[PDB]
Amino acid sequence: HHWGYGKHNGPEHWHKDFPIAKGERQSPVDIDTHTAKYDPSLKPLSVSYDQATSLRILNNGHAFNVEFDDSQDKAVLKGGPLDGTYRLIQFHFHWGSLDGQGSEHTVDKKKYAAELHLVHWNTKYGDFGKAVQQPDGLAVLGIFLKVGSAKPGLQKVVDVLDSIKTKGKSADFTNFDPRGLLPESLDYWTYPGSLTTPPLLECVTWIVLKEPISVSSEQVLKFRKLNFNGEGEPEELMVDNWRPAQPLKNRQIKASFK
Numbered sequence: 542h543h544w545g546y547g548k549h550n551g552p553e554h555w556h557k558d559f560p561i562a563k564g565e566r567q568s569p570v571d572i573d574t575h576t577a578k579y580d581p582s583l584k585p586l587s588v589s590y591d592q593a594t595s596l597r598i599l600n601n602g603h604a605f606n607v608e609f610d611d612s613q614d615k616a617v618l619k620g621g622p623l624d625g626t627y628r629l630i631q632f633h634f635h636w637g638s639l640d641g642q643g644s645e646h647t648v649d650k651k652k653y654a655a656e657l658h659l660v661h662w663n664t665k666y667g668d669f670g671k672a673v674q675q676p677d678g679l680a681v682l683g684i685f686l687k688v689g690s691a692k693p694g695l696q697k698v699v700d701v702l703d704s705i706k707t708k709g710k711s712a713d714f715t716n717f718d719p720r721g722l723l724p725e726s727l728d729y730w731t732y733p734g735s736l737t738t739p740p741l742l743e744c745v746t747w748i749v750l751k752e753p754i755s756v757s758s759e760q761v762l763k764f765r766k767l768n769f770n771g772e773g774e775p776e777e778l779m780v781d782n783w784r785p786a787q788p789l790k791n792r793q794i795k796a797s798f799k
């Protein structure tokens with residue numbers, strides 16, 4: 542037994558090994574757009590990715606991670622709701638078996654085909670491992686994907702997936718520019734939450750962009766050819782690797798835009 546996204550190990554089972562799954566600040570949530578309040582004290586988001594150094598791409602049996610050098614302030618997120626500098630460590634996606642599902646956050650109950658998470662840690666805590674012991678340790682930039690026209694800046698990711706088909710495979714992945722994954726607008730919603738995979742730690746300031754990016758049907762079809770299993774094991778397609786919306790509890794979602 543190990544956690545996953547199947548009938549016997551999926552989100553309804555996670556609380557048995559990770560009791561915080563039933564906690565007070567779990568993610569994702571539904572973003573009810575009429576209940577979210579504009580906050581004039583929020584700042585524009587500052588995304589500084591010009592000096593990013595990607596290193597490697599890894600199939601971890603749950604998703605694929607594109608990893609970055611986080612030993613200096615090379616790719617950072619400031620401003621917005623944040624009171625510090627947050628360094629990019631990795632990005633990954635969640636996606637569906639069908640175009641009508643796959644996102645973790647929803648917007649007025651609408652599901653997108655996929656969701657991109659750019660994961661950053663607060664530099665005042667020194668390393669990612671210490672940051673995930675803190676209530677303000679992480680900031681995750683979430684971006685919705687809809688199916689339509691292709692996203693050119695995603696294609697290098699699509700094309701390497703053949704070399705990391707199965708759990709545990711990694712490949713060199715240098716000189717990837719994450720600026721190619723952003724929409725035009727940086728307008729956002731924000732709320733306090735958690736990692737959406739075990740260990741489900743309640744360390745995250747979520748920043749979810751209002752504008753989706755559009756990717757082609759062929760791009761998301763290639764995500765769906767990945768495998769949850771290892772090489773030489775029975776093939777189980779890596780699809781529907783999303784957690785559903787969780788109770789909002791005593792939280793307020795704020796909007797950067799009126």
Ligand SMILES: NS(=O)(=O)c1ccc(Cl)s1
Pocket residue numbers: 658660681735736737738
């Ligand atoms: N899915 S997420 O909350 O971005 C996340 C899961 C594990 C991480 Cl490390 S970051």
Ligand code: NA
Pocket residue numbers: 576577578793794
């Ligand atoms: Na509100």
Ligand code: NA
Pocket residue numbers: 612613
């Ligand atoms: Na270094």
Ligand SMILES: [Zn+2]
Pocket residue numbers: 633634635658737
């Ligand atoms: Zn995620």
